[PDB]
Every structure is written in structure tokens, then in C-alpha cells.
């Protein structure tokens, strides 16, 4: 969930 | 989709190196210089004692926080990369979840001090003692071992910024969908790396250079570890331990 999250937050 | 998917040139190999160490400077958490000026700042004898008083729930908490913070450190680097966002979301995930620990765990010799055998820890720099708390004392000194053996190196931040780079760029790491993809960044990136030593007259560290079992022992330790401290105070991790610590130790 989390890593998802950083990984689409630009 | 991206350029070192492929065959690069020398030119190109070059533009890598820079790149590289640019994604890591800005991500690389706290200044080297910040680091080596407050290696006067020791904990106190009391201070040590405070830190071994407090509970072993309270302890791991604190340090899952701080290893936390610096893995999101981590996962901009990944994010700044060349390649890396190019690469399909399981992939990116696979490699982040193998290899964060293991770029916290080299980012780390720049923290560590040889030469009194401490480590910068909440705003001071502190022995191995001052982990006691925590149950699990020869993965505290097999970390310790492991920073002590690379600071013997003396690595740059360029070389630092080029070795982590490699650290999580691995090929070899299990579940890979676009293994081939992973296979060519991997080794452009090593070119990038070889390249620099070459270039500064460094080739010498090559050989010097942990072997890769080591990095996975410490994570598989930590694990165990992280597994043993589960068992005694679930809640404590449900309840308190980061998110992403859970993400990336626990499965969630
Ligand atoms: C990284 C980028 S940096 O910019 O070089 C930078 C930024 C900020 C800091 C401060 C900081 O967070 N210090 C910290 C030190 C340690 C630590 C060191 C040695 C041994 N054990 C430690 O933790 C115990 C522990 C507990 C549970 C599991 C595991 C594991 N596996 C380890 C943890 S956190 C330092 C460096
Ligand atoms: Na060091």
C-alpha cells in the first residue's frame, strides 16, 4: 500500500 | 523505453556518472559535512544508561521510526534514478523491497565513526551499548562490523551515490518481470561505477568491497530479529511500528 503510494506521488 | 536499456557509449556512460551522483546528493538525508562535525558530540555515560533503561518495545519503536525515515530517503533516490521509474511497478517494488535495507545499511558507514567505534543516533554519536535494549546484540555489532569495514574503505559521497545505485539495481533479485530490462541498467550502471574508480585511480577498492551474501545476511538477521521481537509484543508492532517498516519486513 505505502510503497505503492510513494511510488505514484510525483 | 529508456536509454540505458540498451548499449551505452562512453559519452553516454559518462552523462550516468553525473546523473547518478546528482539523484543521490539531493536524497542523501543528512550533509557529510553535518555528520563529521558532530562526531565531538558523544552520549554521556548517563545518557548511554538512559537509553539501555528504557524498554525493549520503546527502544525497537524508536529505531523502526528512524529506520523508516531513512529508507524513505531511499525510495527518492530509487524514485531519481535513471531507468528506474521506466521499469513496470512490480518491478520497482521487488527492487525496493530486496534492496532499501541494504542502501540504509551502506548510506550508514558515512554515520559511523571508527575511530571510537560509534554511530550518529538521535542527534549524538553512541557505542553499540547504547542499543542493549533491543534483545539482539550480535546483529547490533554485526552492523557495527559491517560500517567498520566499510569506512576502512574511505568512500566518497561520488562512490557512496554509484555503489548504492548498484545496490538496488540487482538482476538477481526474485520475482523480476522484465528481468532482461533490469539485467542492461545493471550493468550500465556498473560501467558508471567502474568507470569513476577508474577514472580517479580507486580501482583498488573493487576488490575490497563486501561480498554480496554479506548485505543479505543483515537483512535476513534484522528479519529474524524483527520476527523474535513480533512474538513478545504483537501490538506493539500492529499498533506502533511504521507503515512502510511493516510493508517492507513484515508483509504488510
Ligand atoms: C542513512 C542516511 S545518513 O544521512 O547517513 C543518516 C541519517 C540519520 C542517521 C540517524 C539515525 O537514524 N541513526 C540510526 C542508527 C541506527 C543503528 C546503527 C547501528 C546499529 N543499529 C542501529 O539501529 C538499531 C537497530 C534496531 C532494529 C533493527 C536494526 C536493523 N537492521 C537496527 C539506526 S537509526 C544516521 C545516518
Ligand atoms: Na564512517
Redesign the interface.
Known amino acids: 500500500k505505502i510503497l505503492h503510494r510513494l511510488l505514484q506521488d510525483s | 523505453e529508456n536509454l540505458y536499456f540498451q548499449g551505452a557509449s562512453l559519452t553516454e556512460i559518462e552523462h550516468l556518472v553525473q546523473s547518478v551522483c546528482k539523484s543521490y546528493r539531493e536524497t542523501c538525508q543528512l550533509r557529510l559535512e553535518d555528520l563529521l562535525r558532530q562526531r565531538s558530540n558523544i552520549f554521556s555515560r548517563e545518557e548511554v544508561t538512559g537509553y539501555q533503561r528504557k524498554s525493549m518495545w520503546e527502544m525497537w519503536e524508536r529505531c523502526a521510526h528512524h529506520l523508516t525515515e531513512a529508507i524513505?530517503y531511499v525510495?527518492e533516490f530509487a524514485?531519481r534514478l535513471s531507468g528506474f521509474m521506466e521499469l513496470c511497478?512490480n518491478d520497482?517494488?521487488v527492487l525496493?523491497?530486496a534492496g532499501a535495507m541494504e542502501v540504509v545499511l551502506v548510506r550508514m558507514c558515512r554515520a559511523y565513526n571508527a575511530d571510537n567505534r560509534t554511530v550518529f543516533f538521535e542527534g549524538k554519536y553512541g557505542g553499540m551499548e547504547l542499543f542493549r535494549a533491543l534483545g539482539c546484540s550480535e546483529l547490533i555489532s554485526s552492523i557495527f562490523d559491517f560500517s567498520h569495514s566499510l569506512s576502512a574503505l574511505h568512500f566518497s559521497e561520488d562512490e557512496i551515490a554509484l555503489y548504492t545505485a548498484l545496490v538496488l539495481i540487482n538482476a538477481h533479485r526474485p520475482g523480476l518481470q522484465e528481468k532482461r530490462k533490469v539485467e542492461q541498467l545493471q550493468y550500465n550502471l556498473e560501467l558508471a561505477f567502474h568507470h569513476h574508480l577508474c577514472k580517479t585511480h580507486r580501482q583498488s577498492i573493487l576488490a575490497k568491497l563486501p561480498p554480496k551474501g554479506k548485505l543479505r545476511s543483515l537483512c535476513s538477521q534484522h528479519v529474524e530479529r524483527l520476527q523474535i521481537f513480533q512474538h513478545l509484543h504483537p501490538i506493539v508492532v500492529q499498533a506502533a511500528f511504521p507503515?512502510?517498516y511493516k510493508?517492507?519486513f513484515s508483509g504488510?
Open positions: 524513505q525510495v524514485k511497478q520497482q517494488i525496493l523491497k507503515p512502510l510493508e517492507l504488510g
